[PDB]
Design a protein around this ligand. Structure first.
Ligand SMILES: Nc1ncnc2[nH]cnc12
Ligand SMILES: Nc1ncnc2[nH]cnc12
Ligand code: NA
Ligand code: NA
Lengths: 177, 177
C-alpha cells in the first residue's frame, strides 16, 4: 500500500533547476486507488485523536486536507494568501527564498477548545506550516499534529516543526533538496 | 438538504466593493454536514454518467472537484495558473476584468476517450471554465458537464457555457453580480 502510493509519485529531474529531483504529486491525484488510499491512511491515523477541525493551506493543501476533513466528519478551514478570504482575518508572515509573504485565516473559524489537524502535500522547509500553526494558536486553537503525503527530511522541515511542539506524520519520504 | 446547504453559505455586503453581496462558501466548508452533503449531491448526480476523470481549477475548485473524484472513484486532474505544473502542459488564455491570464493542464492527464467532469465552487462569468473546456477538448477528452455549488445566473456564465455545449448543474443560485 505505502509502496503503491510511493510508486505513483513521479520524479522530474533538473526541474525547476538542474540537480533538483522534483517529486510530482499530481500523478498520485490522477490514480484513484493511490489517492483514496492516501486519504484513508491519513484519516485513520487520526481517528482516535479527538480532532475537531482540519486546516490546509492553498492550494495543494486543499487536495489533502479537505478530503481528510470529510473522512473524519469535521469542518475544513482554509489558510490563504492575502485578499482572498472575505470575513475578518488575522495574518502571519513567512519567508520565501526571495522575499516575504503572508498567510491569513478567518478569525471565526477557530475557537478555544478546537483540536486542529494541519494537512499539506509535501513538507519541505516548513515555513508555511510554522506560520499556519501560529495563526491557529493565536485564535485559541490547539495544534500538535501535521500530516503530509511527502517529507523531504533534508530540508529541515520536520526538525523545525518539532521545535514548535508539532508531531509530523508523513506517508513517504524522499532524499534531496 | 438543499436548503441546509444554502443556509450554511454566508453573505458579506459591500465586499469587495459597495453593492456586491459576496457569497462566501468557506462557511459551508467548516460545516461538516453541509460540506459532505454537497459532495454527496454532486457525486450522486453523475453516478450513471460514465465519468472517467474530474477536473478542477485552483484553488476553490480543488475543494469540490477532488472530493467528487474520490467519491466517484476516478482520477482528479488539476488546472493551474502557469508555472506550477511540472510536466508537459498546454495552455489557454482567458480574460480577467483588468487583463489576461492563462490556465495550464498536464498533456498526459487527459487522453482520447476520457469522459470528463469539470467541478468548481461558483459560476460567475464562466471564463475560467470556458478555458478549461478548451484544454480538455484539445487533448481528446470529452466534456459536456460542469458542476458548481453556486450559480450567479445574472453574470451569464451558464448561457455562455451552453454555447460550448456544456450542461451546468448547480446546487444553489443567488441574485446579483
Ligand atoms: N524536490 C522537491 N519536489 C517537490 N517540491 C519541492 N519543494 C522543495 N523541493 C522539492
Ligand atoms: N457575489 C459574488 N460572490 C462570490 N463570488 C463572486 N464572483 C463574482 N460575484 C461574486
Ligand atoms: Na475565533
Ligand atoms: Na494526453
Amino acid at each position: 500500500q505505502l509502496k503503491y502510493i510511493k510508486d505513483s509519485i513521479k520524479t522530474i529531474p533538473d526541474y525547476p533547476k538542474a540537480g533538483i529531483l522534483f517529486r510530482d504529486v499530481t500523478s498520485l491525484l490522477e490514480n484513484p486507488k493511490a489517492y483514496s488510499a492516501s486519504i484513508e491512511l491519513l484519516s485513520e491515523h487520526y481517528s482516535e485523536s479527538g480532532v475537531t477541525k482540519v486546516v490546509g493551506t492553498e492550494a495543494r493543501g486543499f487536495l489533502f486536507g479537505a478530503p481528510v476533513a470529510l473522512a473524519l466528519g469535521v469542518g475544513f478551514v482554509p489558510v490563504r494568501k492575502p485578499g482572498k478570504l472575505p470575513r475578518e482575518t488575522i495574518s502571519e508572515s513567512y519567508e520565501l527564498e526571495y522575499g516575504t509573504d503572508t498567510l491569513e485565516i478567518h478569525t471565526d473559524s477557530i475557537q478555544p477548545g478546537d483540536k486542529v489537524l494541519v494537512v499539506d502535500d509535501l513538507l519541505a522547509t516548513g515555513g508555511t506550516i510554522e506560520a499556519t500553526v501560529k495563526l491557529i494558536r493565536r485564535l485559541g486553537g490547539e495544534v500538535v499534529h501535521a500530516a503530509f503525503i511527502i517529507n523531504l527530511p533534508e530540508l529541515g522541515g520536520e526538525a523545525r516543526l518539532t521545535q514548535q511542539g508539532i508531531h509530523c506524520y508523513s506517508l513517504v519520504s524522499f532524499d534531496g533538496h
